[PDB]
Coordinates of C-alpha atoms in Angstrom, one line a residue:
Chain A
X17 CA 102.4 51.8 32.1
X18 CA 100.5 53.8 29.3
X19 CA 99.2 50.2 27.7
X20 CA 98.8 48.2 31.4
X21 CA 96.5 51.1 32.5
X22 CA 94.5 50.7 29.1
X23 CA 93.7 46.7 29.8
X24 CA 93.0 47.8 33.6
X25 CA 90.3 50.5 32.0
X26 CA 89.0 47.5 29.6
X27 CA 88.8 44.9 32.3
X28 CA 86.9 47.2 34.6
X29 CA 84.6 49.3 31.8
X30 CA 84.5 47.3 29.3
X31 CA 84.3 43.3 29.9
X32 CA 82.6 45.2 33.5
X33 CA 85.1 42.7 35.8
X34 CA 86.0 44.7 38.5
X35 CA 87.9 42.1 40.8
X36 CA 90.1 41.3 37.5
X37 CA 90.7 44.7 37.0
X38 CA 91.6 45.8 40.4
X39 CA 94.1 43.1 40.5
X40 CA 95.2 45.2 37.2
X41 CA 95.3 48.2 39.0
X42 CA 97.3 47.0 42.0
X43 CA 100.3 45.4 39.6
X44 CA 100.1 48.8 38.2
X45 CA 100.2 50.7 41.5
X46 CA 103.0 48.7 43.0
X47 CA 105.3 50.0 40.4
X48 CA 104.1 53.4 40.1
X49 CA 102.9 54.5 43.9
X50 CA 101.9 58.2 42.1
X51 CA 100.1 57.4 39.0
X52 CA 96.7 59.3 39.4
X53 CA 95.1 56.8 36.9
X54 CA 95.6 53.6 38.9
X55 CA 94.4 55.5 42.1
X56 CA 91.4 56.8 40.4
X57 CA 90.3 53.7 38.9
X58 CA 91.6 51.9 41.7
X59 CA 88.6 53.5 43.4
X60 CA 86.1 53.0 41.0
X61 CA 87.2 49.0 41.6
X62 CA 86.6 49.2 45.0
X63 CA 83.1 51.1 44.6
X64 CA 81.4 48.4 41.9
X65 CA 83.0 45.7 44.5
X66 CA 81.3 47.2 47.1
X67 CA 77.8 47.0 45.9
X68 CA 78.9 44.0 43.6
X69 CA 80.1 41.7 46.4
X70 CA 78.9 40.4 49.7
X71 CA 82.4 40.3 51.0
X72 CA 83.3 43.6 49.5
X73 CA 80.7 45.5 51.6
X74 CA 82.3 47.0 54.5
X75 CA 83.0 50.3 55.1
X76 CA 86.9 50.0 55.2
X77 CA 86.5 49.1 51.1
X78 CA 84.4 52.8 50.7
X79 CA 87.1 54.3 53.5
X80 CA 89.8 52.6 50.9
X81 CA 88.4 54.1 47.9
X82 CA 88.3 57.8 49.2
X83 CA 91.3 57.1 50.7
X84 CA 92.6 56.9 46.9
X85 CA 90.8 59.9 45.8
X86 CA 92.7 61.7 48.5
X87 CA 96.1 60.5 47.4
X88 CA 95.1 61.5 44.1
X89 CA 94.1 64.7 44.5
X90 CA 97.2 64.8 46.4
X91 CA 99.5 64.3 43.5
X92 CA 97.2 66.4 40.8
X93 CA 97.6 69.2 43.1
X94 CA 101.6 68.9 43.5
X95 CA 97.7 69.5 36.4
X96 CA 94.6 71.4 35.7
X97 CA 92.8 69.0 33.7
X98 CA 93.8 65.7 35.7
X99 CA 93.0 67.8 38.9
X100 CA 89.7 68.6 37.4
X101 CA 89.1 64.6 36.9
X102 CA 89.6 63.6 40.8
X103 CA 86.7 65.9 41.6
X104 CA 84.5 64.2 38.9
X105 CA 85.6 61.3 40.6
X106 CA 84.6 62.6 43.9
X107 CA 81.5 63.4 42.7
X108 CA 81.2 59.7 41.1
X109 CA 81.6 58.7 44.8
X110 CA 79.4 61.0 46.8
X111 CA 76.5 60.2 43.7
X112 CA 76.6 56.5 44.7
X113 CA 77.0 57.0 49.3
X114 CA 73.5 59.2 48.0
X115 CA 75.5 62.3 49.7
X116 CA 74.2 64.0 46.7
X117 CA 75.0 67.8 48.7
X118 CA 78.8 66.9 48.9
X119 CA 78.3 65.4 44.9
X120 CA 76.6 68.8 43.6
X121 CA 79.9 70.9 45.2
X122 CA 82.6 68.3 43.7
X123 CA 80.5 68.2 40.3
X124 CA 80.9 72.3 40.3
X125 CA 85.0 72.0 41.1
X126 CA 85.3 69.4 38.2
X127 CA 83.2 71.7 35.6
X128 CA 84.9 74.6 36.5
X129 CA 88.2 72.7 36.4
X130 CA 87.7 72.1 32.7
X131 CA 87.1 68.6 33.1
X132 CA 85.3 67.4 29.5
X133 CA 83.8 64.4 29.5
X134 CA 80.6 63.0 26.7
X135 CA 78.7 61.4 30.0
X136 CA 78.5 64.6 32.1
X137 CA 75.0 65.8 30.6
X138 CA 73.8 62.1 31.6
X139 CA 75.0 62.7 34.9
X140 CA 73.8 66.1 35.3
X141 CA 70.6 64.7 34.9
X142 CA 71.0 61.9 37.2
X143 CA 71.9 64.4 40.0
X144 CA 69.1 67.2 38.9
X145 CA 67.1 63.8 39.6
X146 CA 68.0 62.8 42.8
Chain B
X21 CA 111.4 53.3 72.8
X22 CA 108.5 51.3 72.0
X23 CA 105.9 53.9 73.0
X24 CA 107.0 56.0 69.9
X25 CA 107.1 53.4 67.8
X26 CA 103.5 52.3 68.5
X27 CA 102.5 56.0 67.9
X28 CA 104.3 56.3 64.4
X29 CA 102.4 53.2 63.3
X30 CA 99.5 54.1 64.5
X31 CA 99.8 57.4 62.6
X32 CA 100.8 54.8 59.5
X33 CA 97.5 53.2 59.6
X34 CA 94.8 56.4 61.0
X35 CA 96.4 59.5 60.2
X36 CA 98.7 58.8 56.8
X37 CA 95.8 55.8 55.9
X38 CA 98.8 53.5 54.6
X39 CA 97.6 50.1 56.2
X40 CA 100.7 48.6 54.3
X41 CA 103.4 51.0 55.5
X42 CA 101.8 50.4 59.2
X43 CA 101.6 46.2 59.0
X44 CA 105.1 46.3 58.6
X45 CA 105.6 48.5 61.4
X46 CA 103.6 46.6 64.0
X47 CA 105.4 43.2 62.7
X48 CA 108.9 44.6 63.8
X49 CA 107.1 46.2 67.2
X50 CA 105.8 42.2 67.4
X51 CA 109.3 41.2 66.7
X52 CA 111.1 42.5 69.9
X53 CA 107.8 42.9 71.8
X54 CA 105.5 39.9 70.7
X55 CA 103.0 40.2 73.9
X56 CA 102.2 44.0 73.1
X57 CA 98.3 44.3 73.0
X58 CA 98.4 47.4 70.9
X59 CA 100.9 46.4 68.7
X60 CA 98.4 42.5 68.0
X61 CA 95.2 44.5 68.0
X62 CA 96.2 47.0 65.4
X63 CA 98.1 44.8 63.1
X64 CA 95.1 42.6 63.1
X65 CA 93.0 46.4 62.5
X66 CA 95.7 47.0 59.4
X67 CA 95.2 43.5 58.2
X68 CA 91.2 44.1 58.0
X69 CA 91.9 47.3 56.0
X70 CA 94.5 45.9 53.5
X71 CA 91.2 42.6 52.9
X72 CA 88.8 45.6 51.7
X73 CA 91.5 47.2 49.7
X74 CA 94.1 45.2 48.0
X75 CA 93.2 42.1 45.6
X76 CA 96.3 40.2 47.2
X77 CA 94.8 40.6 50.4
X78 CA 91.4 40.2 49.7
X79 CA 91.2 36.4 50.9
X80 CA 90.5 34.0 54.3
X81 CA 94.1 33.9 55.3
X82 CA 94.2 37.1 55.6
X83 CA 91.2 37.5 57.6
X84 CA 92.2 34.4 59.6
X85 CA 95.4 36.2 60.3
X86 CA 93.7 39.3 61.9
X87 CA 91.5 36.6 64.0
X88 CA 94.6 34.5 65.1
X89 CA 96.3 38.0 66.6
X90 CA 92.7 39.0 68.3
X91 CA 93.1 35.0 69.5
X92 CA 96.8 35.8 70.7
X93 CA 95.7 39.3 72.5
X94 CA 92.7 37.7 74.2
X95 CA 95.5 35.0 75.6
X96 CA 97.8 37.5 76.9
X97 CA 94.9 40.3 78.3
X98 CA 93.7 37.4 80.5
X99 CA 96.9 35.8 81.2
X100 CA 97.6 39.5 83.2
X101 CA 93.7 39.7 84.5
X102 CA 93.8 43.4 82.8
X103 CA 89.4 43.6 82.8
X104 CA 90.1 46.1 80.9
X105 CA 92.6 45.0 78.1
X106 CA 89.8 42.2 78.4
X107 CA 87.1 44.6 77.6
X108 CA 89.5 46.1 74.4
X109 CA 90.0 42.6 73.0
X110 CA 86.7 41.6 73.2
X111 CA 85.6 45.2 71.8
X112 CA 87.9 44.4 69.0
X113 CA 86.4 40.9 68.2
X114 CA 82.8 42.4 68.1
X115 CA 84.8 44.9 65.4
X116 CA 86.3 42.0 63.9
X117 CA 82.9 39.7 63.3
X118 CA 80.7 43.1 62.5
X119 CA 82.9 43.8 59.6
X120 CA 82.5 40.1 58.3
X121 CA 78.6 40.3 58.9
X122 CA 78.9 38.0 61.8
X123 CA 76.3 40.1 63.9
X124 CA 75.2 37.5 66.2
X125 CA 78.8 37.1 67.5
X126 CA 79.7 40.3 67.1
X127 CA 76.4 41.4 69.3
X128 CA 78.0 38.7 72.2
X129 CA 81.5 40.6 72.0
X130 CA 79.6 44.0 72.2
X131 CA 78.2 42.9 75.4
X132 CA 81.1 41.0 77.0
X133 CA 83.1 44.4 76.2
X134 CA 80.6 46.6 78.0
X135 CA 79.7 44.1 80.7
X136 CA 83.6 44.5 81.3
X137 CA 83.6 48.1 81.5
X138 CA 84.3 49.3 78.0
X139 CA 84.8 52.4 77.3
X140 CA 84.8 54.5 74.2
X141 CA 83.0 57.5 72.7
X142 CA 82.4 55.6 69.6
X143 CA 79.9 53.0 71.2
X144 CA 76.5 54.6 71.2
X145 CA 77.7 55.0 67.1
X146 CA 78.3 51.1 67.0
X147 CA 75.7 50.3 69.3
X148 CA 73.3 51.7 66.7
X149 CA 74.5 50.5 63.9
X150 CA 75.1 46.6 65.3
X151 CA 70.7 47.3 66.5
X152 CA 70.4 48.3 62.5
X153 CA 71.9 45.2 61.3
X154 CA 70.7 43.1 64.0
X155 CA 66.8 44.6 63.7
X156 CA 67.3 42.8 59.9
Chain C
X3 CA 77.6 19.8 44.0
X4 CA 76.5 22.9 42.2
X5 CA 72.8 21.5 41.7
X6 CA 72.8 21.4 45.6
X7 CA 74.4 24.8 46.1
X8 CA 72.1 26.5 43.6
X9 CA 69.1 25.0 45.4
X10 CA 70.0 26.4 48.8
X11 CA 71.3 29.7 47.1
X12 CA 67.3 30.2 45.5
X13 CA 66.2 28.9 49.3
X14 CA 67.8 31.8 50.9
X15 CA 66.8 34.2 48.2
X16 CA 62.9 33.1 47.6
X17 CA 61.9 31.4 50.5
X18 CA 64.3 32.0 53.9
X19 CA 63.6 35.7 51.9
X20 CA 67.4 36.7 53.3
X21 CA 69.1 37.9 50.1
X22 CA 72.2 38.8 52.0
X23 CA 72.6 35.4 52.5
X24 CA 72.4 34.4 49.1
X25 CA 74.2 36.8 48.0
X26 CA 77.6 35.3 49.4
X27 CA 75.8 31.7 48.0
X28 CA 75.8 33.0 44.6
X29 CA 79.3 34.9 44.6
X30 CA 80.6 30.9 46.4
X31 CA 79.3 29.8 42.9
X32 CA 80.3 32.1 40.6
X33 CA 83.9 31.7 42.2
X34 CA 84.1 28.1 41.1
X35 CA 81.6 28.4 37.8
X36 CA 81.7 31.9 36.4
X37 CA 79.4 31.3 33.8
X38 CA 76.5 29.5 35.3
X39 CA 73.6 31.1 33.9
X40 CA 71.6 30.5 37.1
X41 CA 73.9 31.9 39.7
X42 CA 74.2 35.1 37.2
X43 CA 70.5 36.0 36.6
X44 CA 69.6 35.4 40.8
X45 CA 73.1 37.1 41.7
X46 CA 71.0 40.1 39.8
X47 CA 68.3 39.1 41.9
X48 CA 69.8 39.1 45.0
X49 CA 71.4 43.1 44.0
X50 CA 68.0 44.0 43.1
X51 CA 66.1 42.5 46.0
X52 CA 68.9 44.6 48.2
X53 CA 68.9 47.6 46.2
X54 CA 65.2 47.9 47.5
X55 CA 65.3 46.8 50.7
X56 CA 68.9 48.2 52.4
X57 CA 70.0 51.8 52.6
X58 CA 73.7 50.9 52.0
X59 CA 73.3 49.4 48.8
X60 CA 70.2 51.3 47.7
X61 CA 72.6 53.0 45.0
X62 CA 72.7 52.5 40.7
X63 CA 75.9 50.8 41.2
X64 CA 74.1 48.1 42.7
X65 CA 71.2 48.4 39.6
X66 CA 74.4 48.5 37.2
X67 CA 75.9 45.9 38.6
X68 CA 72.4 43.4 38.7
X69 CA 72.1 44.8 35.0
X70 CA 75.6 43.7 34.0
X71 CA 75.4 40.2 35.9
X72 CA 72.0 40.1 33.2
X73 CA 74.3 41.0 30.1
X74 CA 77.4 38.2 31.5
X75 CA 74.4 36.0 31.3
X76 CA 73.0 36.7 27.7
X77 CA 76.9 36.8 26.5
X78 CA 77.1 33.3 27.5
X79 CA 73.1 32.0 27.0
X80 CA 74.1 33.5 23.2
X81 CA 77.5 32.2 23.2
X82 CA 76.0 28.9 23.5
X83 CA 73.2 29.5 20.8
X84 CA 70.3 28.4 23.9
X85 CA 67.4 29.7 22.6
X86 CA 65.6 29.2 25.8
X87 CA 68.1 30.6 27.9
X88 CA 68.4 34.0 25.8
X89 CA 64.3 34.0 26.1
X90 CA 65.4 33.6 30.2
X91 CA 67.9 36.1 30.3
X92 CA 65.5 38.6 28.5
X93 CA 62.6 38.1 31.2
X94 CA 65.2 38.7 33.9
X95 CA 65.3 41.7 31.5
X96 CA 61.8 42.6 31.9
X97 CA 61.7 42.3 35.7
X98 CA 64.7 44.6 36.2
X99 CA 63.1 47.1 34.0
X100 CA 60.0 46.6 35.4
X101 CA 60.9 47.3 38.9
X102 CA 63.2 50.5 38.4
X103 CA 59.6 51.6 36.6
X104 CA 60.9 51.6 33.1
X105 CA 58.1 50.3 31.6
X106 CA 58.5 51.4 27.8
X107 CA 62.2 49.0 28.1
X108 CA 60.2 46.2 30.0
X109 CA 57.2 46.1 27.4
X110 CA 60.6 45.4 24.9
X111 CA 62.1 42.5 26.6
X112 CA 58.6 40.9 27.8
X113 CA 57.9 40.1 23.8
X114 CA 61.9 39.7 23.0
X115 CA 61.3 36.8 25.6
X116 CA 57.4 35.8 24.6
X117 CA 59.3 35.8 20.8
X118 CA 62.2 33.7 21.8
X119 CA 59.4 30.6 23.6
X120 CA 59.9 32.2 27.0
X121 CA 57.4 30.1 29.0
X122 CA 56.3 30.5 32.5
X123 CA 52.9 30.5 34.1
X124 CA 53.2 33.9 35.6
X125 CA 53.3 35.2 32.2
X126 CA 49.1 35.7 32.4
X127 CA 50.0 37.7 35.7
X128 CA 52.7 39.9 34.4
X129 CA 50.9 40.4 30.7
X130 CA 47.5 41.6 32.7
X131 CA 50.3 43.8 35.4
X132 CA 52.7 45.7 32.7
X133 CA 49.1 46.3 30.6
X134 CA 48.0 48.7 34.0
X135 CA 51.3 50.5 34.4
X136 CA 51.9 51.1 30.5
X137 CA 47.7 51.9 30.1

């Protein structure tokens, strides 16, 4: 699981191929239901397909993608750190619907979770922007 | 009964938001009852969800498929002369073709719907957003 | 054939001025030719033109993915060695820049591309336009 996840990060991040890596995600997913990786990024899939894709923009694919936030937060709640990373997540989500009141609150939770991340002075920014 | 069992799938697919776990259950309420309108309106509705959120479903079968049980509902709501299980189909095709960007059909269903006594609190929501799409 | 489909893709875009439209047209030919440099660059187009005109896609996912269609395209236009379709991809550059009013980045790719042949007779236009906003 540890190395699929890793070539589902690369196919999505890296080589920026979201369909290819959603695919990734799925295969993932259908063995482990649970794993708040493949939900999260799952997610993030759905998002760049969204506003990548003609036939990916629909509200059910944003509906889906929150929908696997949810389930997430679900299972982090049932670890600090990887409870902290759904709400950056949330925040990722709300930043990009331009609900940038909902992103502020879910950018707080995440910080004060402990989540650590090298982009989150880029994206404090991008929200003391908007 | 099937009463129940339309209720627990219908939980499966709003209230738990597991379009999978709720497919299955309307294909085994469309097993022993294949003429139930909520039973081929919602799997269609799960189908729809499962295209916009799973790579294996994201294709034209599957939105063919949803069509094909909107086709099948329309058959058996006029088959019966319920106006308004007419008015729910055709409220579910404008649903159908507003989600594939089809607004010019959609905009025909919207109005064969409310011409045939539609109702829903949701419509001055839709009837907004299909004037948004439509006004571009 | 792609020629065809390309054609009535940039009709939708440029002149029908419907980039929803040829949106789906582009993403039809990027299905069956991923790395056509032409569907690629006016796929971008298409995000940007959307990104500025709808309030559902008016989001920097939509910019990060037009920029990312750009860099596909110079991964391939270099991958080939094309000079004159890295000078292309690099005006593409310049316009994307240009219109999310990063003008120091635009100035950068507007000689990358004037330095790699880039020709195109709106060039006089655009030189005498990025001089105003970066004067």
């Amino acid at each position: 699981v540890e190395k699929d996840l890793k070539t589902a990060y690369k196919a999505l991040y890296d080589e920026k191929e979201p369909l290819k890596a959603l695919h990734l995600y799925d295969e993932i997913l259908k063995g482990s239901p649970t794993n708040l990786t493949a939900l999260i990024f799952k997610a993030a899939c759905l998002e760049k397909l969204y506003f990548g894709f003609s036939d990916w923009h629909s509200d059910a694919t944003m509906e889906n993608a929150k929908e696997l936030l949810d389930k997430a937060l679900m299972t982090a709640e049932g670890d600090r750190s990887k409870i902290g990373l759904v709400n950056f997540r949330y925040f990722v989500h709300f930043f990009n619907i331009k609900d940038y009141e909902l992103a502020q609150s879910y950018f707080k939770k995440a910080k004060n979770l402990g989540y650590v991340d090298d982009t989150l002075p880029l994206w404090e920014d991008r929200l003391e922007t908007k």
